[PDB]
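DATA SHEET
Item: assembly model
Revision: 1
Owner: S.N.
Input lines:
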Amino acid sequence: NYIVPGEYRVAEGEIEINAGREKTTIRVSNTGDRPIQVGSHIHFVEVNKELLFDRAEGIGRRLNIPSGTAARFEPGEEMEVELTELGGNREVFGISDLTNGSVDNKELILQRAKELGYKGVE
Amino acid sequence: MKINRQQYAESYGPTVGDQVRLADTDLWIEVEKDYTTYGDEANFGGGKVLREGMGENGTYTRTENVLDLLLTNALILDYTGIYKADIGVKDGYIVGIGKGGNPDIMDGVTPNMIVGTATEVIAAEGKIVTAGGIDTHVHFINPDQVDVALANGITTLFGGGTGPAEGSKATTVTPGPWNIEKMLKSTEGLPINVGILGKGHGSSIAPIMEQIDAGAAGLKIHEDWGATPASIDRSLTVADEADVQVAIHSDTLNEAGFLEDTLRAINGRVIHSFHVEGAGGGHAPDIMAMAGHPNVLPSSTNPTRPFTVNTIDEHLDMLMVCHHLKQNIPEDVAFADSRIRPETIAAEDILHDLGIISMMSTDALAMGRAGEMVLRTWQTADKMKKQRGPLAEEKNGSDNFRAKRYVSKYTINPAIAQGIAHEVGSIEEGKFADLVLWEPKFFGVKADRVIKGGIIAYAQIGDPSASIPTPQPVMGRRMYGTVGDLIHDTNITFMSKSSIQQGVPAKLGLKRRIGTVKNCRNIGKKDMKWNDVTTDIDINPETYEVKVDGEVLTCEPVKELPMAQRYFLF
Amino acid sequence: MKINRQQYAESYGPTVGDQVRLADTDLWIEVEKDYTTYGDEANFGGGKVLREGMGENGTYTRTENVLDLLLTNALILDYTGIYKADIGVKDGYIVGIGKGGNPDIMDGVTPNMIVGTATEVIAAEGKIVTAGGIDTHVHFINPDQVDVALANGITTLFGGGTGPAEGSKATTVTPGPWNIEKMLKSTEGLPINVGILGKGHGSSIAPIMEQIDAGAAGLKIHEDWGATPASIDRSLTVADEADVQVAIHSDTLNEAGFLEDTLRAINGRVIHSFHVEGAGGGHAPDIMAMAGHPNVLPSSTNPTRPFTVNTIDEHLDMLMVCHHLKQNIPEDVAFADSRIRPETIAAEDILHDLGIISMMSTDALAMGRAGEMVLRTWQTADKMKKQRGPLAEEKNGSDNFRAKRYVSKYTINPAIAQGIAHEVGSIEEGKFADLVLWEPKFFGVKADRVIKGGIIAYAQIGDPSASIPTPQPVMGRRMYGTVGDLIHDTNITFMSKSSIQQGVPAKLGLKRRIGTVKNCRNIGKKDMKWNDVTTDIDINPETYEVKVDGEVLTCEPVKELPMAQRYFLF
Amino acid sequence: MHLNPAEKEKLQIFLASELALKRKARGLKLNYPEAVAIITSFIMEGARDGKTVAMLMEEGKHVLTRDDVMEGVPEMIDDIQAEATFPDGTKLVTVHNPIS
Amino acid sequence: MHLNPAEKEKLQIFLASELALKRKARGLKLNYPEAVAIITSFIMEGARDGKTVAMLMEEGKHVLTRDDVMEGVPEMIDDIQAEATFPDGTKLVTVHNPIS
Amino acid sequence: MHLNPAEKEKLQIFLASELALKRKARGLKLNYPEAVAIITSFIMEGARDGKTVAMLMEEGKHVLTRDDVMEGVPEMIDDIQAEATFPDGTKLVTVHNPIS
Ligand SMILES: [Ag+]
Ligand SMILES: [Ag+]
Ligand SMILES: [Ag+]
Ligand SMILES: [Ag+]
Ligand code: NI
Ligand code: NI
Ligand code: NI
Ligand code: NI
Ligand SMILES: [O]
Ligand SMILES: [O]
């Protein structure tokens, strides 16, 4: 009974994040010469044009990582990440201006991605 | 993907079933529920979630369900519960307790808690958030008293005084229309909520009522002005008509009556009994029996809180200095021994623990400490856990029942007693955003940030010349809520309905928010949250022993308290 | 009758060709010209020249070419020149730079610089006089920051914040109409000029524009809110319509783009690049290449200024504390090493010296020092003289060219960038009388007197109980310009044209002078006084080496600075 | 440090007490504010040591004697009052007629 | 002297450090603000001596040990931060986990 | 104590002088505010001792020498002025060119 003022006594167990949502693993390569770090809640298809991956598999999704954390890609680095599904209304506005509406509009998102040179539109 | 509960609590603050120690006390609070959706927690910073198109909505204008301010991941401690939520503020009021962010991409977002372009962020992860403290026994003696109150989490001062005049140095009284007008104008410069008490003394209605019409928010009956049957009766007749609260400091000397005479004058009407234990004042020796009655809203002042080894020696001498007593006048020695009683101070600890005394208060600068109402509330709860054990009502090994009973004593119960709980006293939707953030290590000792009307008024913060604000010296400082005209929009002057209907704010040029006192005459003990017990309190006239349900109430004084020498430089 | 030049300079301050050392630096400024008529110098005191019928005119009423205030014998240091003149002030503005006194008996009197009954005198003989500093990277976190700024000669604060909220602690942002209104009201109590930045974030125009209409003077794009292509584009569309400046802290993480992506979103529009070197924030590692572009107005923040032996150790740990980095998370270590770079901090010293970085600023209380913008400007110029030698442009062995290039970085250039150089930023006729007097021994370290709108606001002055004001303790103190309603007439709130046209000052009850932001969208690098260089800056992605015209920019860190341990008690 | 208003003020008392003690050490008879500062600081450091209110009410009457202070100073000081954090929290000490 | 706002504030830290050191010298276990004041003043006097930021980041972890302070104080102090004028101007020192 | 505004301010000078003297004792050359604080406090403690204005105008020129202070500090201090309560009430002392 050493007292640490304000200390936690946390319950037993683990917290599952993004419970009940579909998970998807994809390979992503930083084709650029500068580091890219991606946060938990950016619409994955709208990341830096120099990240090469199957852009279709980023639509309606974000990184399956604890809220407020990031995946880092060093220059030239290729690695796998796990994605989860966006929730709420599944709409995205702004960011890279690829969606500005429902994430259901896959053709329109990919058409804009390809036109602006977001790498990996099949 | 899963996070263990230690890392989860480090990142976002604790979640359901996690416990947190209150400062260096033995008291543990447990998270009862959490409004979050695990994985969609809101947070602010580099690469974090509250960013445009992500946890921040880039579409909605301010009017379209967007907050002015989100407190992320708060551990709320309130009479309404001990639980985890985001707190949304707009137009200076709490508009949502729930889950903030962006409905575009997040599950479970409370519909009026959108983070948008218009939203400021305060990170409350790992903080305890409470309502601002409501101190209803304030003597306005020295303006330096306001920062003292703010530094210990007090946001409302109810009481009276004109500064260090003897009337004000003894009594919570701003007497008469002119003094009340002058102190309402002074109040324009005080960065805290204020309500002013008039003199509850007279044998005609008009001299008392004209104070209510001038802008007083209530009355104080004090023995120093004559706590006679007539002054008690006229004050309560005025209060019943005006819908304001009466506080009473009764006739200690029993000059015109004993306790039963004061209760007969009250005649079942509603009254706030100040320092009900009686060291601070009242019918010797049995005043504390007031706390048993259904029409009495009973408060303690703080120097008796809780009962310690130095209490009696300190109080006998404090009373000698306060009253100019002479040790060679036997009548002065008999008076002091009739008023300073270990039997009633010890019973006062247990009456708090049982929910029979409903409220705390300071008695700031008259016979009590402006910055120690919150501090001594938790010291008392800690002492009672050590001496009486967990309350029967407790579950899961937590002190949540005792923590709700005790937080009620300095938040919601004084607000209800004063007729101001529509505006302040709890973290509820629709109430004024007076919020206190605490590091658990400093809980009840030194507030981190005090929010007044949705803007920070006071903060423990460091070197103003530094690259970042955390370097030494970290001290209590007034913030932008106190500066310029913002002091008007972030604070409330509480006033009688009649003074408001008669246009006193416009007459005096008051720019502060005007709060209406109301719903004070139709309440009783049953309305005191978690502290609603009526009972026959017997105080033995010979031994001063206190009995409830045939059982003597006694406990030992303690040699040591938590929330003391670990924290304070003096 | 002749005076030798040593006695002349002792009596009246220096004259043409005389040099003055700046504090304890190696930097010398030379008087380029003098407006006086030798023998008719103005001076005030017992038996001196500004007396009725003599150097003071006894005939003219105030309206008849008479000054409210004459600064006698000032050594002006300004982008417009380094020269000797009297400075005349009337209605709070500089109305004459030339020769004051009485045309009755004196030769060469500037016709609107009569000393009359209405004229106050400040003796500037032996003083250096500059414009007040314009700090365009202010976080409003702690009101104690204002005196810190005043004590080092800063008179305008542009930036954002609501006090020590996390949003404000990271970003120069007062978000949304309500926070902007509350901080305009707070501003009524701050004895310094202020302009407030809104949140430059959103994917719809209306949530951004409504901040401009509410009274914001500009916008801040910050990575912490999402420095995305959409937020950059919408902010600049709003700015082009509203005629206000946008500041940017870009996407350090390169999450949505690299530097070339941010520049494509900007699309040749005007923007202020904050902390362009990048330690304070921006595209890792090449953000500083922004300073080569003609549409970029580039500023440094001050902790990198200049490059010293403790800089890197201090900044790696400062970033760890600021960002809550963990030394056992390899991604955090890689991030810190990508952001804190000796190669870019060393090149930043030389880019200042070459006129490629146009502006200084603090980053007050977020990642920079409220009272060190002026101090570190001169420390940088001194280091560059020691390491690079006199600039080619210099003549007569003086540092006048380097002194004009460097004084421009914290006076006129931020004013031009913000759209406020019609009111402030230089000692020119027709501009607001924000003036700083310096003893040469204290130049850039501690201001003697700070004049705000023609009244002293802040002074290094001694014992207020003493027979005279020079006895100890001499310290920085607020003066009568800060007291009562005079704080309103001596300071400017800068606001958007739309907020002014919509009557926001009357709506909020603002009593301060209202300044109009304008002429911000039609400017570029070429408009930065003495700091107008566009060039291709190459930053090697592997080595972080910086090249301009095929030449690597590098210099050594210094172990010692002037304007440091000789002056400061801590 | 998290200094509150009283902790900042009470630093001043300790400082005035240090000044006064240096003046006593070089052989000066102490004046009114010096004597008050010495006895006040004694009380506050006593509380910090964990003494009782009763111990400090006794000890405070023996910190300075009339031969330590100027003519009239004993009669000017009716009592000296100080609040400090004891192990059992803030308490008030009054030392009555501290100097004879 | 020409004191600026920070020079006036930082005098208070030196004073709190002098108070704390006297309390340590008479055998008290130091509390939270005392420990912070001692380590803060050490850093600022170190800068004045001309030490490097790196030297003070090391030394600050050895000014006080857990046997110098009350139960829980080591765990209450995550870090101590101070800005002072080094020979090369103002720099920030942070001492991480100063007391174990 | 009944401190007036000047008594509170002048406590700060004594404190800065104590800080400076500790810095001199560990072998530092003193800077501008340190030198001013030492000589100022000397004057005020001299008045308290009952010295004359004439004695302090002489003595103040011998408190610090140029070998006690940094390069340029002697030339930065033209004079040091202080008001203090002498036995015959408040008087002004100016020490001209205190350091050569
Ligand atoms: Ag009393
Ligand atoms: Ag009394
Ligand atoms: Ag930072
Ligand atoms: Ag950071
Ligand atoms: Ni009372
Ligand atoms: Ni009272
Ligand atoms: Ni930045
Ligand atoms: Ni910034
Ligand atoms: O009271
Ligand atoms: O920044």
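QC remark: Chain D has one domain: 2-100.
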